[PDB]
Design an enzyme around this catalytic site. Structure first.
Site, PDB file in Angstrom:
ATOM      1  N   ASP B  44      21.195  56.487 -30.888  1.00 32.38           N
ATOM      2  CA  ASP B  44      20.412  57.351 -31.807  1.00 32.38           C
ATOM      3  C   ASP B  44      20.978  57.260 -33.236  1.00 32.38           C
ATOM      4  OD1 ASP B  44      18.530  59.875 -32.216  1.00 32.38           O
ATOM      5  OD2 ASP B  44      20.537  60.460 -32.920  1.00 32.38           O
ATOM      6  N   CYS B 137       7.826  59.245 -31.500  1.00 28.74           N
ATOM      7  CA  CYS B 137       9.104  59.959 -31.281  1.00 28.74           C
ATOM      8  C   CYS B 137       9.033  61.487 -31.349  1.00 28.74           C
ATOM      9  CB  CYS B 137      10.206  59.388 -32.175  1.00 28.74           C
ATOM     10  SG  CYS B 137      11.742  60.289 -32.077  1.00 28.74           S
ATOM     11  N   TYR B 141       9.316  64.013 -27.946  1.00 30.74           N
ATOM     12  CA  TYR B 141      10.333  65.057 -27.861  1.00 30.74           C
ATOM     13  C   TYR B 141       9.750  66.486 -27.844  1.00 30.74           C
ATOM     14  CZ  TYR B 141      14.319  61.823 -28.374  1.00 30.74           C
ATOM     15  OH  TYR B 141      15.281  60.866 -28.164  1.00 30.74           O
ATOM     16  N   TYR B 167      13.994  70.880 -29.418  1.00 28.60           N
ATOM     17  CA  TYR B 167      12.834  70.008 -29.447  1.00 28.60           C
ATOM     18  C   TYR B 167      11.510  70.727 -29.176  1.00 28.60           C
ATOM     19  CZ  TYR B 167      15.951  66.223 -30.483  1.00 28.60           C
ATOM     20  OH  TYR B 167      16.912  65.420 -31.056  1.00 28.60           O
ATOM     21  N   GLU B 208      10.245  54.618 -26.612  1.00 31.22           N
ATOM     22  CA  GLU B 208      10.985  55.887 -26.474  1.00 31.22           C
ATOM     23  C   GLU B 208      11.432  56.123 -25.022  1.00 31.22           C
ATOM     24  OE1 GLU B 208      12.405  57.936 -28.526  1.00 31.22           O
ATOM     25  OE2 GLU B 208      11.729  57.038 -30.392  1.00 31.22           O
TER      26      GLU B 208
END
Lengths: 226, 227, 235, 226
Positions: B44, B137, B141, B167, B208
């Protein structure tokens, strides 16, 4: 002498020609025509928009973190706008800057200059090639401003005097950064590469001459022929 | 249904697969291995910094000065931004976040993902092609976070429940910013262009999925052989 | 219908027509007029050949950069053929001018040179090749090269001022026919590739073509007057 | 040891993995399924235009005419030449080659591979970065072909033995051309640059492993549930 000093010194005779051309001479005297100021301010805006895309295109070429933050800081400074020098010229011709820049102006000389910066930004992996193409902008303005402040022919009674005062001091920090980058990014370059980078700087100094003059003579693309 | 909503809706079945994979399932339970966490945080941090280049590359493609400001804001976040969810996972493995991310990690699945973004940034004039490769992304999330909050398997006694909580709320604005950006950029695109842009979005949703799983299985380029 | 034609003209025809007044200026300028008469200076010939060799090298690179933009394999094959032809060496037109000045071509052209007008033209072609996805933008920037030369060559062959005793008449003769396939292909590509372009895109593609026609005028004049980058003082 | 030989030697353990995978082992035995053969041939035919683009993109990066001619000759071969090994696989499954390749195939592993080539073609000014991403292919096939010819497990009664025979000698000249190109283009590269170029070569060797395997397993982008 260092590489950036060699470039700066080689460019000075061209800058002397710029200083002695009609645009800067008339502006020194506080007598530059409304039309020349308007066309300069309108063009300048188009060029500056591309100078910003060029900065963005340099970000992937940088390996150093400090260099990337420098580029981002420059983009942010350019996006804030409201440069005191533009306000000085707007005041001088009694038209608000917002109203003047509603009419976009790439005349031929602008198109050449902009496409010179883009060519390097697309074609050359080493940022020095592009930096050399953009660096003459703040250096030319700095030299002109400083010279005007000591020129007995400076019209100090005109608001145009503040345009020269602005450039006499506000470009130095950027000129120093570009010199440090050209010196650093060219350490491992060949003699043929350094020649090309030097030429980019000299050509951009010529482009600056042509840019002021393009506004001075109302240069346009003449598509109808003769 | 708008183009951006069509894309997000189409990505849902892939997000369900991500949610049911070992990384998210073990994390829900507060049972994800320290190694998986460490490798995920390293990857990340490694890619967040690399995305700086993708955003920079889109600046010349934007006709709107407000879209340029958006891109510059994202660059600043890639460079010096903090994500509280990072601290949560660092606390979970009892290691300082800044120590964990000293080692850069670039696995095969990450290579594929970043090269998908670069291909679009280089090759396609319309920024929509690249925005569609980046947009899944936050939605991935957000969906995971919101779902986790109502899941019986969520271990609320583990600090990992705060990762899901984070998130569940902190991505929604960015999802909306990307929706509006995609809808405006694609207003005049052809059907062929829209299909390709949609494919970029679905592929990046799969990227992802692989971003989590490459940490989960400790995926490496196997240069040394013997499988 | 209204998408395909404007004032009874295809997009390529509109561009060609808009460029004709500039081509008339090129034809009546000193470089072409002196060349027609067989009176062009040896210096102008050398200056032209040196710059033209540099320009054609870049033109070849532009063709290579168009390959990935083409959806049709037939279009790719056309581009590869043009590159192959460029690589065979010396355009016959260059040999005619070398013969006119009584010098071997290989002794005239020794180094790369992009004088100001050539530099602008080349960087214009490159801008489009790098920045624009639709090949029409780049084709428009390059198409005045074969178009200008074809129009000039054909005009010269009918012009009573053509000096048929000078070997320079062979330069015009070459351009009167050898650009026709390329003009035709570029026109077809411009018409096909702009079918779904917006009015803004079409305006920019058209301006690329007219700018390049102006660049052609300046390229000939650059050779005529020995235009060069002047990096010294008091200019 | 030359730079290119170092790359090739480093790639050998990966090639050993490829040789022992299902695609090559089944092909060695003359039992690779009809579906795997078709998917392989379809993928090969589908990426030909993309590989052509990669070679075209390198033309402006070459300083040497002879290197430009090489790139053009490769493109010409791809566009107008025929690979006898394709006809051998078509014969093996009793289907005409032209019929097999009517359908295009672009699997996830192929997307990765081609995006790796494009990344280099776009981002790196020195053609070596992209050449290193392309060069593993002929070496992988040469090593496999030569190994097969000495392997007792080779089914010599199946027409598939001719596929291995073809590759055992038909790639060697291209391998050499790529060697010399990489050695010349990297002669003044930094150690950091060489490490990246080597990595590109090793990654592409793995991409070749996945190019065979994606046909073997009928790999697909699965956009729906599971």
């Amino acid at each position: 002498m260092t590489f950036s000093k060699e470039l700066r010194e080689a460019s000075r005779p061209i800058i002397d020609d710029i200083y002695n051309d009609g645009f800067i001479q008339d502006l020194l005297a506080g007598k530059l025509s409304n039309q020349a100021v308007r066309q300069y301010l309108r063009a300048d805006a188009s060029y500056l928009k591309e100078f910003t895309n060029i900065y963005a295109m340099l970000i992937p070429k940088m390996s150093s973190m400090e260099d990337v933050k420098f580029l981002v800081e420059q983009i942010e400074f350019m996006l804030e706008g409201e440069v005191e020098a533009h306000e000085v010229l707007a005041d001088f011709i009694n038209e608000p800057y917002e109203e003047i820049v509603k009419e976009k102006v790439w005349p031929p000389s602008g198109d050449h200059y902009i496409k010179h910066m883009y060519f390097n930004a697309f074609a050359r992996e080493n940022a020095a090639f592009t930096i050399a193409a953009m660096a003459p902008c703040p250096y030319v303005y700095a030299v002109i401003g400083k010279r005007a402040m000591e020129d007995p022919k400076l019209n100090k009674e005109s608001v145009t005097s503040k345009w020269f005062q602005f450039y006499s001091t506000e470009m130095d920090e950027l000129v120093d950064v570009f010199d440090q980058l050209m010196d650093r990014l060219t350490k491992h370059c060949s003699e043929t590469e350094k020649k090309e980078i030097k030429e980019n700087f000299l050509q951009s100094t010529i482009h600056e001459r042509h840019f002021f003059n393009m506004a001075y003579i109302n240069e346009k693309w003449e598509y109808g022929g003769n």
